[PDB]
Each structure stands twice: as structure tokens, then as C-alpha cells.
């Protein structure tokens, strides 16, 4: 039935496929994946839209894809052959996700060894974010992308603070130490560029030798803070590993600033503003709950 349906709206679109190596993903509140190799045998990824609307709110995102594609050699991202409103389609990456999340346990099925990274991981991460943050933005004749200089970053920050405290409240201490980065001029970059802005194992596409070779859902990209790209890499694998993607960064030519560290950790402290700004936008109660406990009230 679902894989009938595949298969019709896949021939509409020109694409042929193999039906028995046709895979369904979970899931779905936007779009449903679906995995499957044409004729030739080359592997696809389908995405079957749940929601009206399509082309526009698709449209940023697939800009940010275009830059990419058009600019970057040493990471791959998802380029969309078929885009209408009733199938996005791309060639499947090469190699495989650090990491993919399983829903029935809570956590990552890792392809890596969490407590004996690969050194090559960070090295490489590095390289492929320091590429991706210097990209032209610019040169576009249209960019409906967020933008922000080093200025209204900040400035972004703060306003998003105060509407999730309006809201929410926030834990007094947490507010505090809120403030104090907001406050510290020194903490703050001078530059700004195009990022990914949901950087994490399952986006995160690696060959045998676990080299960063592509990303994939870009649905957050736009050109602010390039810090933002950091955090897993704290959360995942402490400061070393935060220090790790810090030094590859820097060495290859990514901005770097002497303060950058410490930001970075500040803005991991202010993970909360996100994920109370996603319990609003969603309805989800179980992020609810997780956004009141990570905003301490
Ligand atoms: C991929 O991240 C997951 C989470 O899963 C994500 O939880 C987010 C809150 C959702 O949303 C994202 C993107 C965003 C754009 O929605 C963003 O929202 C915003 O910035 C604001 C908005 C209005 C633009 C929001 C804060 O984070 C994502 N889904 C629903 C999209 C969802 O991934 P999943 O689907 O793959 O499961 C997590 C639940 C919620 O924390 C998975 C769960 C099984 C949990 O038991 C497992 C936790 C593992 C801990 C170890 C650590 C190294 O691992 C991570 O650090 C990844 C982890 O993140 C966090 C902070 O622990
Ligand atoms: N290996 C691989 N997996 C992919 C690729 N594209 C999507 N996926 C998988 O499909 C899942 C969902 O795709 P994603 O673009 O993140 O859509 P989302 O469900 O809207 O978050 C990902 O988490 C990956 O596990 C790809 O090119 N290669
Ligand atoms: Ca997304
Ligand atoms: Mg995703």
C-alpha cells in the first residue's frame, strides 16, 4: 500500500526504482523519509511531505543547500534533483551517520567509540566547518536566509533570552550567568558566517576511517554565530573534544578568537532558550517538560 504509493509518486517524478530495496523511516511530522536504489543501483533518499505549504517552507533551506553545493569540495550535502510539492529526492550520501538516534533506547547506536575518538574525527570536522563557515553567502542574488553580523548575533541572543523568561521564567543563577556572557564583550566573535545549525552525530556522515564526508538536514541554516556548529562536539566529547574540533578549526584557517572556548561553553549553558523555544513552537509535551527543567524554575 505505502510502497505502492512510493512507487507512483516516484514514476511521476522520472525516478525509477528497485521496489524490493524500498525502506521506510520512522516518524514524520513535516516529512516522511524513505529509502530506495534506482534501476542503476544507485541509492536515494525520498521525502514525502505531510504538511501543505512545501515550496515556501522549503524555500531557505534549499538556498543554503544550493550554497552548498555550488561552493563546497571537501563535505557533500544533499543535492535535491527532484523538488516539488509531492517529492524531494537526492542521491544518497556516501558513508555512514557517526551516530543515529534509537528511539526505543534514548541515545545514539554509535558508529564510533565515544571515550576513543578517532583523532582524524575532529581533525576532519574541522576542516569541513571551517570550509562551511567561509563560504560566500554574498555573492547570492537572493538570500531569504536569517542574517546577522557579529553584532545582531548578540542582539539575537539577548531578545531570545527575554521572550523565553516572559514566558517560561528562568532559574535566578541561570539568568545570572545568562547575563554575564551577554555582557562580556570580550567573549563575543567578530564574524559571523553561513552554518549548519543542528551539527550532530546523526547529521554527521563519515567514511571508514571516520573522515567527515557530508551533512545532511540543513532545515536550521543560516548565517550567524559559527559557535552554534561547536556544541555537540562538547556535549558528545567534553572540553577535549570540544578543544580537539577548536584546534583543527583554527589551524586550517577558521576564525578563531582567544575567547571562543569559553563562549562556546556559555552558549552550551544557554541550550534552554532552544529547547523551550521548540516546546512552544511544536506542542510536544515531553519537550515541555525537558524545557522547564533546563530552564531551572
Ligand atoms: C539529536 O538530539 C538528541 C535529542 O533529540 C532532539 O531533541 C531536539 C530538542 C529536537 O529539536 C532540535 C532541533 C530544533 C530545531 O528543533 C531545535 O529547536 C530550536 O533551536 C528552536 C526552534 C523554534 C527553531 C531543538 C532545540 O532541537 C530534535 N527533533 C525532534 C527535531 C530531536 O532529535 P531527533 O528528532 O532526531 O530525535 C534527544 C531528545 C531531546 O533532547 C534524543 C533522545 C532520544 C534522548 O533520550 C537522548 C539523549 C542523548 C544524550 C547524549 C548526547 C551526546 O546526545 C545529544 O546531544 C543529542 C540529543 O540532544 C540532546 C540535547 O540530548
Ligand atoms: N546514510 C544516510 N542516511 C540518511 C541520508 N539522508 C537521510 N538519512 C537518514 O534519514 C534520517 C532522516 O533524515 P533527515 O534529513 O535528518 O530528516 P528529519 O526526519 O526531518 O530530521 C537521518 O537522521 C538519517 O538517519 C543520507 O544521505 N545518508
Ligand atoms: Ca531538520
Ligand atoms: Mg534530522
Known amino acids: 500500500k505505502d510502497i505502492k504509493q512510493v512507487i507512483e509518486i516516484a514514476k511521476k517524478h522520472n525516478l525509477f526504482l528497485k521496489e524490493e530495496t524500498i525502506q521506510f523511516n520512522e516518524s514524520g511530522l513535516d516529512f516522511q523519509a524513505v529509502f530506495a536504489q534506482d534501476n542503476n543501483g544507485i541509492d536515494w533518499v525520498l521525502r514525502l511531505p505531510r504538511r501543505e505549504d512545501v515550496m515556501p517552507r522549503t524555500k531557505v533551506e534549499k538556498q543554503a543547500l544550493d550554497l552548498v553545493n555550488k561552493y563546497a569540495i571537501s563535505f557533500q550535502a544533499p543535492n535535491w534533483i527532484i523538488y516539488t510539492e509531492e517529492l524531494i529526492a537526492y542521491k544518497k550520501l556516501d558513508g555512514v551517520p557517526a551516530g543515529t538516534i534509537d528511539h526505543n533506547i ?19 570536522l574541522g576542516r569541513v566547518l571551517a570550509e562551511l563557515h567561509s563560504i560566500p553567502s554574498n555573492k547570492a542574488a537572493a538570500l531569504d536566509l536569517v542574517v546577522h553580523t557579529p553584532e545582531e548575533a548578540r542582539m539575537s541572543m539577548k531578545q531570545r533570552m527575554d521572550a523565553v523568561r516572559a514566558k517560561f521564567g ?10 554575564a556572557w551577554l555582557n562580556d564583550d570580550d567573549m563575543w566573535p567578530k564574524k559571523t558566517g553561513l552554518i ?13 576511517d571516520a573522515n567527515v564526508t557530508g551533512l545532511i538536514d540543513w532545515t536550521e541554516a543560516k548565517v550567524t554565530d559559527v559557535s552554534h556548529d561547536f556544541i555537540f562536539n562538547y556535549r558528545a566529547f567534553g572540553e577535549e573534544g570540544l578543544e580537539a574540533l577548536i584546534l583543527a578549526y583554527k589551524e586550517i584557517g577558521g576564525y578563531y578568537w582567544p575567547k571562543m572556548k569559553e563562549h562556546i561553553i556559555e552558549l552550551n ?3 534552554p532558550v532552544s529547547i523551550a523555544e ?8 515531553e519537550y515541555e517538560q525537558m524545557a522547564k527543567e533546563a530552564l531551572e524554575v
Not at 106 to 124: M, T
Not at 278 to 285: K, N, R, T
Open 106 to 124: 534514548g541515545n545514539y547506536i554509535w558508529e564510533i567509540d565515544i571515550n576513543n575518538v578517532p583523532e582524524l574525527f575532529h581533525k576532519s
Open 170 to 179: 528562568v532559574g535566578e543563577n541561570l539568568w545570572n550567568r545568562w547575563q
Open 196 to 208: 549548519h545549525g543542528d551539527v550532530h552525530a546523526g547529521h554527521t556522515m563519515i567514511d571508514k
Open 269 to 271: 549553558a544557554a541550550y
Open 278 to 285: 521548540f516546546a512552544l513552537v511544536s506542542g510536544i509535551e
